[PDB]
Every structure is written in structure tokens, then in C-alpha cells.
Design an enzyme around this catalytic site. Structure first.
Site, mmCIF file in Angstrom:
data_model
loop_
_atom_site.group_PDB
_atom_site.id
_atom_site.type_symbol
_atom_site.label_atom_id
_atom_site.label_comp_id
_atom_site.label_asym_id
_atom_site.label_seq_id
_atom_site.Cartn_x
_atom_site.Cartn_y
_atom_site.Cartn_z
ATOM 1 N N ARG A 138 145.119 -121.216 47.481
ATOM 2 C CA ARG A 138 143.829 -121.285 46.905
ATOM 3 C C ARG A 138 143.507 -119.929 45.966
ATOM 4 N NH1 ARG A 138 141.403 -125.626 48.962
ATOM 5 N NH2 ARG A 138 142.579 -126.203 50.865
ATOM 6 N N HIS A 170 137.770 -127.126 61.315
ATOM 7 C CA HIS A 170 137.727 -125.511 61.257
ATOM 8 C C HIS A 170 137.226 -125.109 60.173
ATOM 9 C CE1 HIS A 170 141.353 -126.799 59.339
ATOM 10 N NE2 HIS A 170 141.689 -125.649 58.883
ATOM 11 N N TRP A 171 137.158 -125.850 59.051
ATOM 12 C CA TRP A 171 136.664 -125.685 57.819
ATOM 13 C C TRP A 171 135.163 -125.202 57.954
ATOM 14 C CZ3 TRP A 171 137.816 -125.921 51.965
ATOM 15 C CH2 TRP A 171 139.268 -125.731 52.094
ATOM 16 N N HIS A 228 152.226 -129.784 57.586
ATOM 17 C CA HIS A 228 151.544 -128.696 56.531
ATOM 18 C C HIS A 228 152.284 -127.718 56.278
ATOM 19 C CE1 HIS A 228 147.976 -126.535 54.916
ATOM 20 N NE2 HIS A 228 148.205 -125.312 55.906
ATOM 21 N N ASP A 235 148.660 -123.016 51.512
ATOM 22 C CA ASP A 235 147.097 -122.840 52.101
ATOM 23 C C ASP A 235 146.397 -121.723 51.518
ATOM 24 O OD1 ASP A 235 146.233 -123.859 55.304
ATOM 25 O OD2 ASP A 235 145.692 -121.600 55.007
HETATM 26 CL CL LIG Z 1 143.914 -124.215 53.106
#
Ligand SMILES: [Cl-]
Ligand SMILES: [Cl-]
Lengths: 298, 297
Positions: free
Chosen positions: A112, A153-154, A278, A108
Site C-alpha cells: 500500500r 481486522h480492517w 496471503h 500487504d
Molecule cells: Cl494489506
């Protein structure tokens, strides 16, 4: 209070120029840094990290601003919570331990940080694994109606302060549990150790921790995207050998076939799906641990 | 307590098979129905309705489920809050008044009711005006990073219940004021009459009203999009003369060039930008009223 989920692991507060990084440290062998994401803390690795500690010196770190790490003050460009800055701060942290070349797995938000670290500072990494992500650029470039509904939610958490912070503060428990449950295969909290859920809930209960999470998402919509855009348009590829793992019911596989995307970003990438939502290390810990042990041991 | 912002307008509860529609009615002459959007009520027209009532019988209605109109029970497809169903309900409301052929201007959600009404039942309309929207299909088809960030509430409020209801309950007064301010040119609440803001704030304070708003946005992501898609795919165009007004700093102009988009949807459309954010009738009431009277007269 909060359970110790890493029996036998030490605890370190690592000083950096941007604040302390909290980590659990265990095992012996080549160094391996494990990075969590949202809305979790380092404890999400608690089912996988003992298996890794049989072979590696495992450093399970809270991200800058998350968990028990210090929270640097943000700014108008969300600088300390960009993945570029988080990567630099974790490189510093690892150097304090004498680790200038190390293996890295992230999930998650931590994933990144991880691929941005590999783009910015590839000489620091022996091997890289990312769990259930595509690059930030790819999520934004694929943001059509269906995907905007899936990862709303992004764009919600990226709204200017204090809008998400104010909505989240009415009932923080509801939102952290909602996000934990919504992204699992089963759609509930059954995959999580309840002691881990308590760690996540307690971190989320702090308004400054929530603000940091929004800053992370704001960086994700602005500077992180712009940093990724530079690289993809310049044709810069991650040169570190990498493993992309994703959940068959996770986020990355929505709106793209993950290995094809990562082949555009990485010159030496392998990948596999895992039957899971996820949260791979908690929903599918044995499967995740085996994939990581195999990859990092090669 | 709540101010009467329509001196000399009457107040009508119009019965329909789906529940009552609240309206202020004033003026005489041809009938003109005015429809608000989110997160407002009929009082958003308070600066423009008196100018229109010089020439028209002006009916200023709360949308089904909004303001003081009744809230029909929704279902798993958000049916009563689809624009098709809202349009049918308002057609029935107007028939109660004996108005089967009328002019129509709508803003925001009410403009979505209005162009859907024009597509479904064009014989009901003499002329149509839509304020600061593009068709719902167009917003979703233009979804990209920039637009997702700008109209994030389109995907946030469409999330399954009770996620947005619970979050909106976290600070409803902040949220409704934030939406009002952020979509103005000024970026604050100074464009609004404070007494109108109290109307919007009080409607937003009711959890059942907030749920309906989410039902509206859920319809907006699903059935409304599908209904529009059928018309695009069939090449169905609005045959009623129409006016598209938009804010130079508003929402519609972010996605596209609004008159070029509407020309794909309507066979006789004219339009103009207004120096304003999203809330044309309150940020720019004189310019908005002038354009409406000229077009409708
Ligand atoms: Cl993410
Ligand atoms: Cl709208």
C-alpha cells in the site's frame, strides 16, 4: 536472541526527517526496495531476497514504525502512518543511499505504501510490484457482509485507541500467531521459518509496536482511503509499469478479480496468481522470487 | 455485591426445555415482556419498568444465556442463540406463567428476538415495540465502510472461536465499559446508574457469558441473517401493531431512516426518535417510558 536470516547482507540504519529506517542491504546491481506488511517485519523476505540479490542491490527495509525502524509519534489524523507519509519517508531514506530512481516490491501494508508512492511520486520508480493487495479504496468499496467477516481486522484495528490496543495486550502472542496462521493456505504456521515467527512475535510483543500497527490500520480506514478516493475519482492512474501478484487463497482475490481492479488503477499492469495464501514470499518463495526476478529484469 | 434495582418486583426462575430464564416480575394487568440486549442484562429496564408496572404485569427477563438465565449448550450453527430459538424459548417461558398472548418490547439483541418472534409466531403478540434496531438483514445489507467501522463488533464478535473470546479476555472490564460509553450520547458512563454498570460488568467478567455473547453474534452473522432473508424474499411482514423507537444519536439511525425501513417489514408500524444514544431506557427513561405506555395502552 533473534536469528540473522540474511547471511551476507549488511545492516543499515538510515536517518530520515521522520526517524531511522532499519534495512538489510545485499547484492549489487540496480536498487530494489522490498517492503513488508502486517504483522511482519523485513525478515518475511528472507527466502526471496537472496535470489533477488543475485541481480539487484536489495534493500529490505522495516516500514516506518515497524520492526527496528523508529516509531514517529502519531497524531489525530494518524499522519506518519498514512501510506503517503510512509512513502515520503522511504523516498528520503533511499535518497540517503543515493537511490533516486529504484524498483519497488511491497507486500500487504508495504504494498500500500508502494502504490501510493507510485501515485504521488512516480518519477522515483522504475518498476513496481504489489503482492496480494488491492488498493485500500477497493477493499472499503467492496465491504459487504461476506467481506466484513473476512477482513474484520480492517475495522477492528481501526477502532479508536485504546480499544484494540487494550484487547491485544492481554495475550499478544495469540493474536500475532492467529493472524499469521489464518491467512496462509494451510491455516497454520507451517509455511513460516520458526526463526522468522520469532521475529514477528518479538516485534508484536512491544506495546508501542502494537499501537503503531493500529495507527496504520486507522490511517487505512481514514486518510489512506481519502487519498485513494481522490485519485480514483480523478482518474489518476499509476503510470509506472507494475506487477500485481496475488495468492489464489489470499485476501485480494476475496471479493474481486485482482487484475481487473488493478487495470482501473494502473495504465501498464500485468499480473499472475500464485498458489498460496496471503504470505506469498514465505508460502511460495521460489514462485514469488521467479516472478519478481522476471519482472524487474525485463 | 449486586443491588436490587426493581424494588417490589419478584424474582422468578422460569423453567423451559432449554434451561431456566431469570425474570423480575411486578405489576398487574396485561402481560408485557421486556428484553434487553448486549452487553447488558434485564436490569437495563430498571428506570422504565416501574412506570410500566403501573398498568401491566411486567416480566423483565434475561435472554437465554445472558445475565442469570441458564446457558444452553451451543452447536456448530449457534442454534440456541439464534433469535428464532431464543424466541421459541421465551414463548415456552411465558406459557409457564400462563401467558400465551402478551405485549413485548425489546432493545438491541432482545429487539431482534422480538421481531423474529413476531415474524414466526405473531399470534403470541398483542403489540410489539423495538428499541434502536433495524432488522439484522438490513444491517448486513447496508454494510459499507462507514457502517463497518461503526458496528465493527458485528464482524469482530462473529469471528470463529476462540478469537473474540481470547481478545475479550484481554481486558473485559475495559471492553464492556467501552461499549456502554461509546454508544451513549454523552460518550461516557454518566448516563448509567453505577449499580447497573456493576451488574453488566459482573456478567461480562464470566468467560462463559462472554462466549454466549459471541455465539449470539455468530448467529447474527449466519442463521439470523438467513432467517430474515427468507422473510424479505417472501415478502413476509410483521402483522402485529408495532412501535419503532430509536436514538437520535443511536445505531439504527446511522444506517438508514428507521421508520422507512420498518415499514418494509411491518404492516402497521409507528415510531419516533428519542433524544438519546443507543441505550434509550437508561439515557432517556422518561421519554422512553411515556412512548411505551402510550403505545401499549
Ligand atoms: Cl494489506
Ligand atoms: Cl443489536
Amino acid at each position: 536472541d533473534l536469528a540473522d536470516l540474511f547471511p551476507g547482507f549488511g545492516s543499515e540504519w538510515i536517518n530520515t526527517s521522520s526517524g531511522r529506517i532499519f534495512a538489510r542491504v545485499g547484492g549489487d546491481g540496480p536498487p530494489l526496495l522490498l517492503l513488508h506488511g502486517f504483522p511482519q517485519t523485513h525478515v518475511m523476505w528472507h527466502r526471496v531476497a537472496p535470489k533477488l540479490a543475485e541481480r539487484f542491490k536489495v534493500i529490505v527495509a522495516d516500514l516506518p514504525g515497524y520492526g527496528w525502524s523508529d516509531m514517529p509519534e502519531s497524531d489525530e489524523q494518524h499522519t506518519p502512518y498514512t501510506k503517503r507519509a510512509m512513502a515520503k519517508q522511504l523516498i528520503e531514506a533511499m535518497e540517503q543511499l543515493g537511490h533516486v530512481h529504484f524498483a519497488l516490491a511491497g507486500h500487504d501494508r508495504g504494498a500500500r505504501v508502494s502504490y501510493r508512492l507510485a501515485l504521488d511520486s512516480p518519477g522515483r520508480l522504475s518498476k513496481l510490484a504489489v503482492l496480494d493487495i488491492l488498493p485500500t479504496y477497493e477493499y472499503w468499496q467492496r465491504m459487504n457482509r461476506a467481506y466484513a467477516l473476512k477482513i474484520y481486522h480492517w475495522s477492528f484495528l481501526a477502532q479508536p485507541a485504546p480499544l484494540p490496543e487494550n484487547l491485544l495486550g492481554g495475550d499478544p502472542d495469540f493474536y500475532v500467531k492467529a493472524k499469521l496462521a489464518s491467512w496462509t493456505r494451510a491455516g497454520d504456521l507451517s509455511a513460516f521459518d520458526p526463526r522468522a515467527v520469532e521475529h514477528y512475535r518479538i516485534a508484536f510483543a512491544d506495546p508501542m509496536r502494537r499501537h503503531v500497527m493500529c495507527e496504520d490500520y486507522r490511517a487505512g480506514a481514514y486518510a489512506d482511503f481519502e487519498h485513494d478516493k481522490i485519485d480514483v475519482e480523478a482518474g489518476n492512474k499509476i503510470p509506472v509499469p507494475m506487477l500485481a501478484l496475488w495468492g489464489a487463497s489470499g485476501i485480494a482475490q476475496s471479493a474481486a478479480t485482482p487484475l481487473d481492479v488493478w487495470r482501473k488503477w494502473a495504465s501498464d499492469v500485468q499480473g499472475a496468481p500464485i498458489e498460496s495464501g496471503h504470505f506469498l514470499p514465505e508460502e511460495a518463495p521460489d514462485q514469488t522470487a521467479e516472478a519478481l526476478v522476471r519482472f524487474f529484469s525485463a
